[PDB]
From a paper:
The henipavirus matrix protein (M), which drives viral assembly and budding of the virion, also performs non-structural functions as a type I interferon antagonist. Based on the NiV and HeV M X-ray crystal structures and cell-based assays, M possesses a putative monopartite nuclear localization signal (NLS) (residues 82KRKKIR87; NLS1 HeV), positioned on an exposed flexible loop and typical of how many NLSs bind importin alpha (IMPα), and a putative bipartite NLS (244RR-10X-KRK258; NLS2 HeV), positioned within an α-helix that is far less typical. In this pathway, proteins generally display a classical NLS consisting of either one (monopartite) or two (bipartite) clusters of basic residues that bind with high affinity to the acidic pockets on the concave surface of the adaptor protein IMPα. These binding sites on IMPα are denoted the major site, located within armadillo repeat motifs (ARMS) 2–4, and the minor site, located within ARMS 7–8.
We produced crystals containing the HeV M NLS1 bound to IMPα2. The structure of the complex was resolved to 1.9 Å, with crystals belonging to P212121 space group, and a single complex of M NLS1:IMPα2 present in the asymmetric unit. The M NLS1 was bound in the major binding site of IMPα2 (ARMS 2–4), with HeV M residues 81GKRKKIR87 interacting with IMPα2 through 14 hydrogen bonds, 1 salt bridge, and 131 non-bonded contacts. HeV M residues 84KKIR87 occupied the P2-P5 sites of IMPα2, respectively, with K84 making interactions at the IMPα2 P2 site, involving Gly150, Thr155, and Asp192. The interaction interface extended over 895 Å2 of surface area. The minor binding site of IMPα2 was also occupied by electron density that corresponds to HeV M NLS1 residues 81GKRK84; however, the binding of excess peptide in the minor site is a common and well-described phenomenon in the literature. Here, X-ray crystallography revealed that NLS1 engages IMPα as a classical monopartite NLS. Lys84 was shown to be positioned within the P2 site, forming interactions with the well characterized IMPα Gly150, Thr155, Asp192, and the binding was consistent with other NLS cargo binding at the major site, including SV40 T-ag and HIV Tat. Interestingly, the NLS1 region is exposed and accessible in the full-length M structure.
Numbering used by the authors:
A (entry chain A): 74 to 496
B (entry chain C): 80 to 88
C (entry chain B): 81 to 84
The structure:
């Protein structure tokens, strides 16, 4: 307790394994303190290579543990600190410890590899190349996950989620295929932290091209994801919703699996959720559903979600309102005349017009496109004048006229076109 | 859950 | 269209 770095060095440089153990535990305690652990001072003392060599002392398990914990905490820091651990040779030494007969040492190695992989795609891929996946997955090859210690299982799930994480590049396809069956099993486990990190892992794996989405959807997980979308724990709902959102960015068939699994029945709650980030990500998800086929738009209608989109457009955080505007422009670009009429009957025009007062150029462009699409539907019914009156009555004509004189060229063009054609 | 890196205290 |  409270040793100086100088004393730690003195003990670690002794030729006495027990003196080395005591000094390594003292380093672990220094690195474990709540405020400002002296990571850089330990690195600068040259201690990483010694710690790494201690990981290999099978005949002294306590010093394996203390050095694993010390190196975990060094690797928990900046990229430069994690690099110092990797440059010491720690990756293969930790992978060898995954097979330790001492569960607390195996777990510490799991943790350290999670920090290293969590640094970014290069270290992730280097952990994979040194062969970490097979022994990690072997630790979870039990008939019932509930026999494992809870903290150990949580750490295993977390580390596997970091092997799934990051882009440019995404993880190797073969590694993802190797991990996915275990992730599917963890997604059905009943611990909330395991469920959260399993959802995070799936949200990473579905953040990319449609072929990556397909790898996940083919495993049949969309129904469990929709169940978790309904959980009461916000740490579960957040990544489950991110994963669902990612999936509906894919093909119409991938989106339909989300719809078939019952997801839309959760959106009344998600679109009114008191957490701003949930409302925003739910509305983004809705906008990618309304960019789908007419029969998918129809499912949005049937689930009663158009009033909820009108609500979010009327009042929500601005970022959420922007996603809602997108959802409406997609809806009106893809929908039938009857669907677009319905949108107007639900009260979309006034909140849409109110958002033309925003200082964000992109949302104005989006709203003008939506108004154009609605006017096109009205043209097919011969009701353009009725719509013009509605837009004038709520103050929308004033806002569009003003937008004729707007810095962005596309805004001015769109406004003038609307006025000349309909007003 | 979800953290990039985790320190053990 | 979709937005990733």
């Amino acid at each position: 307790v409270n040793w100086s770095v100088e004393d730690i060095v003195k003990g670690i440089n002794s030729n006495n394994l027990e003196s080395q153990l005591q000094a390594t535990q003292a380093a672990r305690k220094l690195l474990s303190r709540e405020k400002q652990p002296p990571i850089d001072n330990i690195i600068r003392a040259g201690l990483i290579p010694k710690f790494v060599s201690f990981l290999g002392k099978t005949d002294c398990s306590p010093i394996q543990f203390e050095s694993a914990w010390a190196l975990t905490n060094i690797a928990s820091g900046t990229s430069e600190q994690t690099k110092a651990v990797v440059d010491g040779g720690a990756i293969p030494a930790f992978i060898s410890l995954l097979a330790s007969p001492h569960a607390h040492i195996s777990e510490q190695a799991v943790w350290a590899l999670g920090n290293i992989a969590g640094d970014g795609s290069a270290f992730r891929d280097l952990v994979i190349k040194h062969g970490a996946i097979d022994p990690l997955l072997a630790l979870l090859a039990v008939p019932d996950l509930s026999t494992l210690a809870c903290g150990y299982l949580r750490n295993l799930t977390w580390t596997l989620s970091n092997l799934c994480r990051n882009k440019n590049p995404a993880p190797p396809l073969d590694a993802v295929e190797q991990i996915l069956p275990t992730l599917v099993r963890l997604l059905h486990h009943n611990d909330p932290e395991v469920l959260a990190d399993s959802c995070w892992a799936i949200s990473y794996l579905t953040d990319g091209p449609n072929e990556r989405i397909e790898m996940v959807v083919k495993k049949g997980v969309v129904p469990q994801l929709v169940k978790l979308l309904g959980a009461t724990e916000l740490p579960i709902v957040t990544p489950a919703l991110r994963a669902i959102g990612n999936i509906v960015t894919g093909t119409d068939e991938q989106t339909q699996k989300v719809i078939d699994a019952g997801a839309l029945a959760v959106f009344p709650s998600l679109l009114t959720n008191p957490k701003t980030n949930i409302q925003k990500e739910a509305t983004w998800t809705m906008s990618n559903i309304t960019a789908g086929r007419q029969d998918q738009i129809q499912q949005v209608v049937n689930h009663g979600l158009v009033p909820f989109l009108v609500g979010v457009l009327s009042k929500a955080d601005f970022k959420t309102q922007k996603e809602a505007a997108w959802a409406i422009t997609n809806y009106t670009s893809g929908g039938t005349v009857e669907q677009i009429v319905y949108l107007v009957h639900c009260g979309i025009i006034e909140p849409l017009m109110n958002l033309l007062s925003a200082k964000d150029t992109k949302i104005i462009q989006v709203i003008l496109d939506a108004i154009s699409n609605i006017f096109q539907a009205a043209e097919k019914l011969g009701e353009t004048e009725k719509l013009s009156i509605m837009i004038e009555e709520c103050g929308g004509l004033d806002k569009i006229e003003a937008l004729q004189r707007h810095e962005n060229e596309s805004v001015y063009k769109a406004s003038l076109n609307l006025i000349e054609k309909y007003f | 859950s979800g953290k990039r890196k985790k320190i053990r205290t």
